[model samples]
Target: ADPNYFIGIQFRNIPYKYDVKIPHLTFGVLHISDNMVPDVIDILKIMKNELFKMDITTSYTYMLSDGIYVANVSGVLSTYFKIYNVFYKNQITFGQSRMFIPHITLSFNNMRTVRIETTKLQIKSIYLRKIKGDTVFDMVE
Candidate 1:
């Protein structure tokens, strides 16, 4: 960690801010990516631009608290469990909220590909923005 580095947002109940930062502006610029479709990267870039256009409310909020929380790259999810609290809530059909399963996904569904062929799951990149004086205002790219 570097003294100059700091993560403004805290997501997944983890403290993203650190001295050393691996995820940079590129991470935010390309939150979602794809390998199946060659143009997927380009499409994601456009989508990223449009995503920021939407109202702030559309964005995902931090469960630990309110508002948006910043977190390190996906790797941080497992590196620190208590902080990067990742959980999957059961669907309405299950009617199980407490039955939620928590886990950290480093990549998209492709990483879990098995026998049956299924559509590719979206891949997202997390970014930390400077907040306050010389800090980032938001994480969105």
Candidate 2:
């Protein structure tokens, strides 16, 4: 897998429900089976198309974080688990320094906290789909 690429992710009914408070979603730090680049891009494209269909009133952007997936969060666990011949779950935890940003944060609302010269990259590619089946067990590197 290319170091520049990362897998797309989706979820429903998140327990944290952070988005309910502020219509924002930070891309969760993920550890997926690598070499699934094709699958990842496919998902991003699907998402982009669907988002385009909507009225487009809200603001959101995907951020590429250098965030680490902590093994556990306080007493919470952030590991993988296999379900009954169905889904494979991966939990992620981020440190406070990560300062969770919204996925749709194309630009910061205020310029007080951010430094200048922030890289402004455009992501015109993505898809929205899920991968299923018996998968090999391994690390994300």
Candidate 3:
């Protein structure tokens, strides 16, 4: 009864500063009984795998700052709708969090709207992090 699941798509090989935090576009979080994990994973995997095999121009032509520097990834909003809607359809509840606004934060404490490079950031893999209150787990692939 300790580990909680945090499922998301992991972005890696980022060419930003080493001190920057890793970026993962979370699909959702689940805190349910153990027996339910396999079905959730199976369903999520099917959706996520399709994305992994998807080819798009991952570009950030600009970034907006309301305080935090964040970029809206191009060509992936539809996937967000799929997962989000399906979760609600199945009555899957998530941990307390703010609304999902798909983005990859580059840094923090900045204040400006600026142009970004079209470097085509990379995605490492999808992940399902199982975190115990006192420890952690980083499950992938």
TM-score of each: 0.20, 0.25, 0.63
Shift in Å, residue 85, candidate 1: 25
Candidate number that wins on TM-score, 1 or 3: 3
Question: RMSD, each candidate, Å?
Answer: 18.5, 14.5, 4.5
Residue-level lDDT of model 3, residues 17-104, one tens digit each, is 3224666565556665656667667667667665565342344423454556665555555765677677667766553453565566
Determine the C-alpha RMSD for candidate 1 after optimal superposition of all C-alphas.
Answer: 18.5
Runs off by more than 4 Å, candidate 2: 1-28, 53-100, 103-141
41-73, model 2: which lDDT tens digit per residue? 443343444433322122212223333111101
* Ordering by TM-score: 3, 2, 1
**Model 1 CA deviation exceeding 4 Å by range:** 1-17, 23-37, 54-141
Stretches off by above 4 angstroms in model 3 are: 1-5, 31-35, 54-67, 94-97, 111-114, 130-141
Error of 1 at 65 (Å): 16
Please estimate how well model 3 matches the true structure, expressed as its whole-model Cα lDDT.
0.56
By TM-score, the best candidate is: 3
Deviation in angstroms for 19 in model 3?
3.4
